[PDB]
Amino acid sequence: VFARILRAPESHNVTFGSFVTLHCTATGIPVPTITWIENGNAVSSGSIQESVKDRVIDSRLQLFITKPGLYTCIATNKHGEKFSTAKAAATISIAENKGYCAQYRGEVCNAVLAKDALVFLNTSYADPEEAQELLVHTAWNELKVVSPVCRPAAEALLCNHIFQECSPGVVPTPIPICREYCLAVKELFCAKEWLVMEESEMHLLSVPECSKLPSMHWDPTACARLPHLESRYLPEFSWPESFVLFLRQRQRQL
Amino acid sequence: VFARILRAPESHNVTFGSFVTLHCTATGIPVPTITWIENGNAVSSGSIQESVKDRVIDSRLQLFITKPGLYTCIATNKHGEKFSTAKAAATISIAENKGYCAQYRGEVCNAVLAKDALVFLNTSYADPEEAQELLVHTAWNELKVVSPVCRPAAEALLCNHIFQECSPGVVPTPIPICREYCLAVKELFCAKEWLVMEEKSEMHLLSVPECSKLPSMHWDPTACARLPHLESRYLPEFSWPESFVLFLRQRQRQL
Amino acid sequence: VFARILRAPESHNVTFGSFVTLHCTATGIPVPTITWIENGNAVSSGSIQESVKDRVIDSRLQLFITKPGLYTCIATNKHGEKFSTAKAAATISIAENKGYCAQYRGEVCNAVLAKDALVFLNTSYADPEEAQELLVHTAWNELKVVSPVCRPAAEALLCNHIFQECSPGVVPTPIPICREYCLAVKELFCAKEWLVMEESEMHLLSVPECSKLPSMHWDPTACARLPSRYLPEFSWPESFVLFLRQRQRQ
Amino acid sequence: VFARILRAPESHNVTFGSFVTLHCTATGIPVPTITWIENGNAVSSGSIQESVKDRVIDSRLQLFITKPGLYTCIATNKHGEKFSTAKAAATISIAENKGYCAQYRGEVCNAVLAKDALVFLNTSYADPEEAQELLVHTAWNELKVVSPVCRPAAEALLCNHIFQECSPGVVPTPIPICREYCLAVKELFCAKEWLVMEESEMHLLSVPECSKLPSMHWDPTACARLPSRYLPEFSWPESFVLFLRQRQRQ
Amino acid sequence: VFARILRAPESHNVTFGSFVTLHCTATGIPVPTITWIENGNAVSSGSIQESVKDRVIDSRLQLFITKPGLYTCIATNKHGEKFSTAKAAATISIAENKGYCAQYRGEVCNAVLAKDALVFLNTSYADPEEAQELLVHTAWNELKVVSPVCRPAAEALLCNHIFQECSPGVVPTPIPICREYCLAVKELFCAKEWLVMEESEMHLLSVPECSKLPSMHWDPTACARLPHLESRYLPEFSWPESFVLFLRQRQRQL
Amino acid sequence: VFARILRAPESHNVTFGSFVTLHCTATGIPVPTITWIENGNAVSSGSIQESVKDRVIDSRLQLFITKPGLYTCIATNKHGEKFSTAKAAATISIAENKGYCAQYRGEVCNAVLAKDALVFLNTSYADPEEAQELLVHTAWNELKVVSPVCRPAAEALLCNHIFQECSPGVVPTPIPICREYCLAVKELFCAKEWLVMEEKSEMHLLSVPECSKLPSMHWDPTACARLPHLESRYLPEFSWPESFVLFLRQRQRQL
Amino acid sequence: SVFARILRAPESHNVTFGSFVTLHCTATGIPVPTITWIENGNAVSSGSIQESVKDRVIDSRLQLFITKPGLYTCIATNKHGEKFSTAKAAATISIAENKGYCAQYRGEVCNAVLAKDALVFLNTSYADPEEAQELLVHTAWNELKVVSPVCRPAAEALLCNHIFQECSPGVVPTPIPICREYCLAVKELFCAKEWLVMEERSEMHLLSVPECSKLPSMHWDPTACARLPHLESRYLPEFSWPESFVLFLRQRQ
Amino acid sequence: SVFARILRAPESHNVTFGSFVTLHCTATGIPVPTITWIENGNAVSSGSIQESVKDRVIDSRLQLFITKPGLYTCIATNKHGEKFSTAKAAATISIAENKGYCAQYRGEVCNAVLAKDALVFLNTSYADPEEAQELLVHTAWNELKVVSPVCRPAAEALLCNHIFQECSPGVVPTPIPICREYCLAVKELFCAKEWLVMEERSEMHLLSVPECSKLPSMHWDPTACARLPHLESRYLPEFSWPESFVLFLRQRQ
Ligand SMILES: *[C@@H]1O[C@H](CO)[C@@H](O)[C@H](O)[C@H]1NC(C)=O
């Protein structure tokens, strides 16, 4: 009846830039709830998938490991007005050319990156294509709410900065974004958005800082420029996929 | 080779609160794009589904009609630097017991509404269940970015305000939201979010509650729905979006 | 057992400036609560004295009637997650040489007013010595927090404006406060407090408007002129003082 | 007759967290006033009970001693335009398993705390049930004015933080409030009030610092979690309530 | 012993722009004090001279009459804690080429106006030289505190605007100040001073409003310009005459 | 014809708090002007008396010496557009019981100080009575424009602070101003005036009271001077200045 | 002859709408006088003064673009001692009485924006169409005042395309207007700060500064209005020497 | 020959302090390339580019006032498709190694301020003194940026008298500096707003913009510093047409 942890988090030793999944299952009546703690506070960046299988709760915390940490599982169910709690912890610790060129095979940048181009994948991460995919989402999480004028420029800028094209040659090396590209987005298309964000290692690796970028006039061949942003007259409020699917199901029930 | 419209949108004469779909089909080389115009401006609220096959683009615009309007589809392709365009317009017109009670059978409010309560469906809308579902989405879109403290209160406030519980009286009449419930969300949990929204519409008036028009919980605690208990969840500060979670799941399954 | 009202409020037909008590008793399991509604909203000004005995709650709302109103008592208890509510309403209505001089016998102005002077009791009120005692308390509620340098000035100003002195002469006539007096407290000693309050028929009877006062220089016989303790910064509440006392006696 | 002190304050050597009363009586024509000085400045926290009989003023300063101090009583009267002052000083000094569980028997927390639970009484204080009753009153003085939506949240927060519940087990140990609880009242219900107060050894013992609290999600068995009246807008002061009462009995 | 008015204010009928003196004497033990009221409020512009002659107080209110008014005398002495008050009132009421050219014979503008020039004296006032002298003081009272950079420009501007020179010719007519002169003082030398004053018939007649003045470029001969303001390195705090006389008396007592 | 200095200023070696007079005499055609310079800048505090007779200008600069300084007189006349100038400099140097009690025999504080009380005269000044008289003037000059509410309080505060009453103890020691007196003037009667002054000096430190350094009236009501009663006078809103009152008196006497 | 005297007075003219006129004033005196031009009693709102001073004689020419009637005055002034001497002479400009033609742009202000292979619409409502619209571009620049380096290329394109509009295809001379979104992008992005300064009414403003709400939308018909061009950036010197100094240096070398 | 190629490269020079130098770059390509000038890796801080494009060839000349060593780079670029082609060529400017003389002012920027009968001090610390100080005046104007009509005459006088200082009487060429009160009047009155914008360090700033605290006082000795002159106001047109348009109109007529 009381909360009890069956499968507990297993400590893991992983390499920098590895995606790891921690597991924790608990049982009890009522079915307990699982909370994941990271070094005393809530997890800073991750995803939790939960499945209530009758009386057992399955909780999976997925992480992108760049620093070591102690992750703790907290299972709790309430009895009358008295909570019951079980705990189990795991320790994630880090072990130990510059990259390779490949076609982008992800989803977040499919509309911005050309399919005939080769981008640079940083082998400092054990899972490069997945790590840099997450960096693009991380930046969008930092920019937060995005105005219609800002989204195409921000999508292009972040995609071109994290999935940079490869220079001509046999040694893999990325084409940076030009300083003017960066300041165009920062000071024009996304001026308000950047301001709020100016009010973290993931931030440093994903959000571009314009001062560290070359100027397009020093050598226009040696950096990437503001792409042509195709303007679309899409509806101001475009109904979410959730509502569109809901409508279609109601039509299918005649 | 130039852009041409095969199936033009057709004029509609519907009742208040009806969902319609406008169709526009075009051809050309290259395949044209189709852009929808609402009274000379972009569609305020709608959904566009598009499909291209063998130099033919089929575009469908879904709308929730509450005012008349002139809708035009613009088919445009480009040869060199010169554009080629064809237009076709359609006119949507409006034509012409207060409601009924039923169980909620939607998704947007599934985590808030009891799976047994009877909510009020406003039959001033031709499509009450779908109309009120869209209203919750409409409200969420006005609030825009929400704090982790605000999202539970807003989800509760909007769902209870749009899908109001039916009073136990024999006549279908909704139980309103209490003023203290609305003021708690607007002034405490969602203080910043409400300010940004007010800084910046019939859809807004029907979807976002105005607390001044609400009754007080103390006048009769049985005649208004109060702030439900909200559970803190201690989720990650940045929860990876669904798009990424699928991507990572699929790629880890490839191996 | 759902909430039930036993004694309902009765309607009253009082005269201007009367003190009236409305009664409402209720019972239930659990014992219900009693809320009072005035003309749809909360009670603007009053006192609620409540008692519970043998599963009966006895609520009494005391008011100062200057305007007619509709009062309602709301009896409410809960059974699990469902409230149960009983309502009962009552209407207070108004019915039907300007005063008299006497010694001040109240409490709120015991320090400012003199123990050997005659104040003006406005017989437009049915209960003059209350009404004016309440009016002083009403003004203090308008000023809210007061600074240590503002309190002695506000106490004097309010007590002299509401308990005005009687003019020498057979006809009872109040001696008002001078405009300079009022302007001094409003623009100097209580300037902050006055500003926050400038940000109600009770308000305009209790708080002076300097603009509608005579000037000391017009005739300094016809109005009253402006007349420190180093107390503890946090002076303990009398509740704790009595709590301390009752327990040392044991 | 110039002001003369009769009984002077005596020095005291008390233990940490004791309640002490200092006495000072004076006489003169006119009857002098008695002011109290603490370490050169005004008394930070205390209660002064004064009485005058047969041209003798009996002043009593009650304090809660947590730190040593130098107290002085200033007896003052006036003869025309010249003040006359007598002084007398006294020094309070400090001298020389962590508590016990018991039922709450005070007044300030009679609503928030349960009548059938055990709270932790910190025996670091010589007078535990006072000290913590005073500490709650001390926090209310820090928040000053509270909004109607902030008051019920502050009452709960203060009463649960100062009268913490005892953990199950033989060793008496207090159950603290969760950080989320504290953060909720500070950032939502009492956010304004908290901001004006963020603009003292007594302060840090009476008012919670959310940063130094456990999290509910770490273990929701190890801390206390967050647990409306539509009263009159201006609820008459008890002083006027009693003034009204005493006179209707006559 | 009580306050009593011996000589009372005498009502007068006067012409526009006349200086009048109202009298009021009172006696009593203690010697009373006199207060002058003008239409219920304190006198807006005037001067009071008082002389305590043993047990009689003499009070003289001097006024510049442009509008009718009711002036009231209030004599009051205190007995214990009870004031005694006597009152007496008077009513000032108004009766009924454009001017003449003369040398300035006043004091307030002696350092600004040339002694060989002829200024315009507006005969709409019964006492022109005295009225326009008062207008200069009135303006200084409106400008209030004056910075060292502002005083020479303000002194010149007000003096040149109220004591304007006479145009060449046989019909008396004044030379206005140029708009540029006015805006120079208003927006440069006295910018802060003017701002405070922007936060009354006497004001309108004495303070220049720059928009109603001609421009010096329309005809440089037809208006008066910013005079050369001689700069002096006088001490920042120049001791008042009161202190200088005090020092000298102490030297004379050896 | 060019500017020449006949009697140059002479160097002085005085004690702290001494009043001195520097002399400078010049001649020329035209008669030169004489300008006084204090350490390369304008004299901070002083009084200049000048006299011209038969192409000779006699200028005297009165000072209250508290610091050493280099004083220079500049004699300048103008021929055409070219200036002609002669300079002469003098060096004032500083050289080397706390006070005494006496009756006030000044003017600046005559309406505030009792005509029988004994005030404290600080003998750190070579010229105590004149020094403290100048200090009141110095303070008034810092306050600048004063409201009709402020002038009585300021007059009282400064006079009581500069000419403090002597304590009845046998040793001359001044009775200070209470903190409550100073805070009342600075924060109530003269609130605006004090703010403008603080926005913008040894003379300032000796003349304008700082309330934080003052004792409290409640520590011992006999050891500090409290806010005296100030009488409202209901004078005209604009009282004609003395210059005008004389002018009008004289001209009305001409007739 | 010592005091200011006008030798050549300005002469009254009757011109058609949108005509460039030049008024003349010659004055003499010892010292040589100054000549101030006054337009309806204020300063000339828009114009150009070229004056040459030769010893005792000043010749002042005032160029104007005439769209409204006006009275213009020459004020000749010299000073002897502290007294001024002034001579005046007035002259009245009054107004008499297919929408245009297509031609290649041949001006200076838009040469970096307008294509050589394009024909622009010249509004024959003006007597001197090419010179009038050239001035309209300059007039808009003056309303815009201080332009940032990022605003300058966008504002140059916007004003040039709006005042020298490309001729619509067909045989009837008609202008192609700039699109709303073109205008809005310059006003709300590239020149956001410059546009807010200007917003805080003159006929020259209305003719020169576009109002974006009265413009057609590119999404209505992309062929029917001018879209935002591809702006070219330049790494010009932070302080680029003024032309007057370039010429001064040329003479010395 | 299609891609950008530099025909004439910039050449390194060794000049003396305060020398005017002109760097040359000629490039060819189809389409004709652009030429960007880079100074120590940033934009040229102060200079002037004159470029002429003739079909397939661009000739760019960059004028500079040399006071510090620097490396200057020519960047020739054209575009074929969506790909750029870039040619670079660098050149290094390095520096070699009575305080002045008196002469009549003969420049353009101060001709309305400086008297014909005055001799000004030319600082021979510069190789080209008259041209250097002329540029210093322009450089100060650029620091001052937007000047009001009331500030302009005062700022013109102040900078001109400060950079072209009158020669002190005697046989040794020495400058007469402007007085503190002159400077303070412009900074605290006429140009009060312009001066606060500038206050929110470069060697060109220090040489061109006066600092009033390092100036002598007119009350010390009125003969020893330049006092504030009598400023002359002008009723110029509110919008005075730019010189480029005046010249454009001249050609058409
Ligand atoms: C208080 O009593 C303790 C007892 O040991 C003593 O040590 C201390 O000095 C006393 N303090 C006083 C008398 O101030």
Curated annotation (Swiss-Prot), chains A, E:
The GO terms this record gives for MF are: ATP binding; metal ion binding; protein tyrosine kinase activity; transmembrane receptor protein tyrosine kinase activity; Wnt-protein binding
Spell out the family assignment given in the record's similarity comment.
Belongs to the protein kinase superfamily. Tyr protein kinase family.
Q: Where is the FZ domain?
A: 97-226
General function of this protein: Receptor tyrosine kinase which plays a central role in the formation and the maintenance of the neuromuscular junction (NMJ), the synapse between the motor neuron and the skeletal muscle. Recruitment of AGRIN by LRP4 to the MUSK signaling complex induces phosphorylation and activation of MUSK, the kinase of the complex.
Annotated GO biological processes are: cell differentiation; cell surface receptor protein tyrosine kinase signaling pathway; memory; neuromuscular junction development; positive regulation of gene expression; positive regulation of protein geranylgeranylation; positive regulation of protein phosphorylation; protein autophosphorylation
Q: What is its main location?
A: membrane
Q: List the disulfide bonds.
A: C24-C73, C101-C166, C109-C159, C150-C190, C178-C223, C182-C210
What protein am I looking at? Muscle, skeletal receptor tyrosine-protein kinase
Q: Ig-like domain location, by residue? A: 3-93
Its keywords, alphabetically, are:
ATP-binding, Cell membrane, Congenital myasthenic syndrome, Developmental protein, Differentiation, Disease variant, Disulfide bond, Glycoprotein, Immunoglobulin domain, Kinase, Magnesium, Membrane, Metal-binding, Muscle protein, Nucleotide-binding, Phosphoprotein, Postsynaptic cell membrane, Receptor, Repeat, Signal, Synapse, Transferase, Transmembrane, Transmembrane helix, Tyrosine-protein kinase, Ubl conjugation
The glycosylation sites are N13, N122
Q: Which GO terms describe its cellular component?
A: neuromuscular junction; plasma membrane; postsynaptic membrane; receptor complex
Cite the post-translational modification comment.
Ubiquitinated by PDZRN3. Ubiquitination promotes endocytosis and lysosomal degradation.
Organism the protein comes from? Homo sapiens (Human)
Q: Superkingdom, according to UniProt?
A: Eukaryota
Q: Subunit comment for this entry?
A: Monomer. Homodimer. Interacts with LRP4; the heterodimer forms an AGRIN receptor complex that binds AGRIN resulting in activation of MUSK. Forms a heterotetramer composed of 2 DOK7 and 2 MUSK molecules which facilitates MUSK trans-autophosphorylation on tyrosine residue and activation. Interacts (via cytoplasmic part) with DOK7 (via IRS-type PTB domain); requires MUSK phosphorylation. Interacts with DVL1 (via DEP domain); the interaction is direct and mediates the formation of a DVL1, MUSK and PAK1 ternary complex involved in AChR clustering.
Question: Where is it localised?
Answer: Postsynaptic cell membrane
Portion of the parent chain present? 210 to 453 of 869
From Swiss-Prot, chains B, F:
Coiled-coil ranges from the UniProt annotation: none
User: What does the entry report about post-translational modification of this chain?
Assistant: Ubiquitinated by PDZRN3. Ubiquitination promotes endocytosis and lysosomal degradation.
Indicate yes or no for the key word DNA-binding. no
GO biological process per UniProt = cell differentiation; cell surface receptor protein tyrosine kinase signaling pathway; memory; neuromuscular junction development; positive regulation of gene expression; positive regulation of protein geranylgeranylation; positive regulation of protein phosphorylation; protein autophosphorylation
**Glycan attachment sites:** N13, N122
Q: Where in the cell is it found?
A: Postsynaptic cell membrane
Q: Where is the FZ domain?
A: 97-227
Disulfide bond residue pairs: C24-C73, C101-C166, C109-C159, C150-C190, C178-C224, C182-C211
Q: Which domain of life is it from?
A: Eukaryota
- Keyword field: ATP-binding, Cell membrane, Congenital myasthenic syndrome, Developmental protein, Differentiation, Disease variant, Disulfide bond, Glycoprotein, Immunoglobulin domain, Kinase, Magnesium, Membrane, Metal-binding, Muscle protein, Nucleotide-binding, Phosphoprotein, Postsynaptic cell membrane, Receptor, Repeat, Signal, Synapse, Transferase, Transmembrane, Transmembrane helix, Tyrosine-protein kinase, Ubl conjugation
Q: Does the record's keyword annotation contain Ion transport? A: no
Recorded GO MF terms: ATP binding; metal ion binding; protein tyrosine kinase activity; transmembrane receptor protein tyrosine kinase activity; Wnt-protein binding
Q: What is the first-listed, main subcellular location in coarse terms?
A: membrane
Ig-like domain boundaries: 3-93
GO cellular component terms, alphabetically, are:
neuromuscular junction; plasma membrane; postsynaptic membrane; receptor complex
Assembly behavior: Monomer. Homodimer. Interacts with LRP4; the heterodimer forms an AGRIN receptor complex that binds AGRIN resulting in activation of MUSK. Forms a heterotetramer composed of 2 DOK7 and 2 MUSK molecules which facilitates MUSK trans-autophosphorylation on tyrosine residue and activation. Interacts (via cytoplasmic part) with DOK7 (via IRS-type PTB domain); requires MUSK phosphorylation. Interacts with DVL1 (via DEP domain); the interaction is direct and mediates the formation of a DVL1, MUSK and PAK1 ternary complex involved in AChR clustering.
The entry's linked illness reads: Myasthenic syndrome, congenital, 9, associated with acetylcholine receptor deficiency: A form of congenital myasthenic syndrome, a group of disorders characterized by failure of neuromuscular transmission, including pre-synaptic, synaptic, and post-synaptic disorders that are not of autoimmune origin. Clinical features are easy fatigability and muscle weakness affecting the axial and limb muscles (with hypotonia in early-onset forms), the ocular muscles (leading to ptosis and ophthalmoplegia), and the facial and bulbar musculature (affecting sucking and swallowing, and leading to dysphonia).
Q: Which family does it belong to?
A: Belongs to the protein kinase superfamily. Tyr protein kinase family.
For this entry, the protein name equals: Muscle, skeletal receptor tyrosine-protein kinase
Traced from the root, the source organism's taxonomic lineage reads: Eukaryota, Metazoa, Chordata, Craniata, Vertebrata
Write the span of the intact protein that is present.
210 to 453 of 869
